Write a protein that binds this ligand. Structure first.
Ligand SMILES: O=C(O)c1ccc(-c2ccccc2Cl)o1
Ligand SMILES: [Mn+2]
Ligand SMILES: [Mn+2]
Ligand code: NA
Length: 262
């Protein structure tokens, strides 16, 4: 079944979420032309281990070889940090972090635009983040995840973009991926009504082109089949009595931590 976090667990999630968000805030200045994704990963891991006294939940997860996932341009997700992969002017890059602290996971990612942004890159990232934001604003007890997934897809598709179907958001807590699955599109299979205390992620993967993807032969790197740009933003949240609280909010987020309804 689905778990409803206790006040104590929610506090631990706040701590874990804050740490994950802080890794993204910390790494930002390093995401510039010339840097390798491999070094960004090491910088993130050193910070997580030595500064936050936490641990990356990604390393070893289903065999994932690195500490954080770094995906560039057409790479949709699971990009493997490589000391030989350099960021360049115009690149859009997603750094996805998941830390475990005091037994709980904080999961979040954001897009970084490297050097001079390309209007398409800016547009895709902005729209992708806005799709996450619109979804967050819908979160509150009584709402069905199907409605949220449908809303995300409708928005994204109205922009001329597509939503990746192979991946979804997820419940989170002592487990990296717990129930329920949080699809970012409309599916007849989705029937999960939100309840206070639920902690999960919303992390839409949006392609500028077609939805189809391909996994490279390193068994991890996923790219858009048409090699169009793909962007993703992710936040871990806790459903409150009248909305939700974003546990991985950053200083650069343009949405409040506490979203209240009435
Ligand atoms: O939920 C996430 O944000 C996420 C990022 C990477 C993964 C993942 C999924 C499946 C196998 C390995 C990994 Cl690292 O999951
Ligand atoms: Mn993630
Ligand atoms: Mn996630
Ligand atoms: Na991408």
């Amino acid at each position: 079944a689905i778990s409803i976090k206790t006040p104590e667990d929610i506090e631990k999630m706040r701590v874990a979420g804050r740490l994950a968000a802080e890794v993204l805030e910390m790494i930002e200045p390093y995401v510039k032309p010339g840097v390798s994704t491999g070094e960004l990963d090491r910088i993130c891991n050193d910070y997580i281990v030595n500064e936050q006294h936490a641990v990356s939940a990604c390393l070893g997860y289903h065999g994932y070889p690195k500490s954080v996932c770094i995906s560039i341009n057409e790479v949709v997700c699971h990009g493997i940090p490589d000391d030989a992969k350099l960021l360049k002017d115009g690149d859009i890059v997603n750094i996805d972090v998941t830390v475990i602290k005091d037994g709980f996971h904080g999961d979040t990612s954001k897009m970084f635009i490297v050097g001079k942004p390309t209007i398409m890159g800016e547009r895709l990232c902005r729209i992708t983040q806005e799709s996450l934001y619109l979804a967050l604003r819908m979160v509150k007890p009584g709402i069905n995840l199907r409605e949220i997934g449908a809303a995300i897809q409708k928005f994204v598709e109205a922009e001329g973009f597509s939503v990746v179907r192979e991946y979804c958001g997820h419940g989170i807590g002592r487990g990296f991926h717990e129930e329920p699955q949080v699809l970012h599109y409309d599916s007849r299979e989705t029937n999960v009504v939100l309840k206070p205390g639920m902690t999960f992620t919303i992390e839409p993967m949006v392609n500028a082109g077609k939805k189809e993807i391909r996994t490279m032969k390193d068994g991890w790197t996923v790219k858009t089949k048409d090699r169009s740009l793909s962007a993703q933003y992710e936040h871990t949240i806790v459903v409150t009595d009248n909305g939700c609280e974003i546990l991985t909010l950053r200083k650069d987020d343009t949405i409040p931590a506490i979203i209240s309804h009435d």
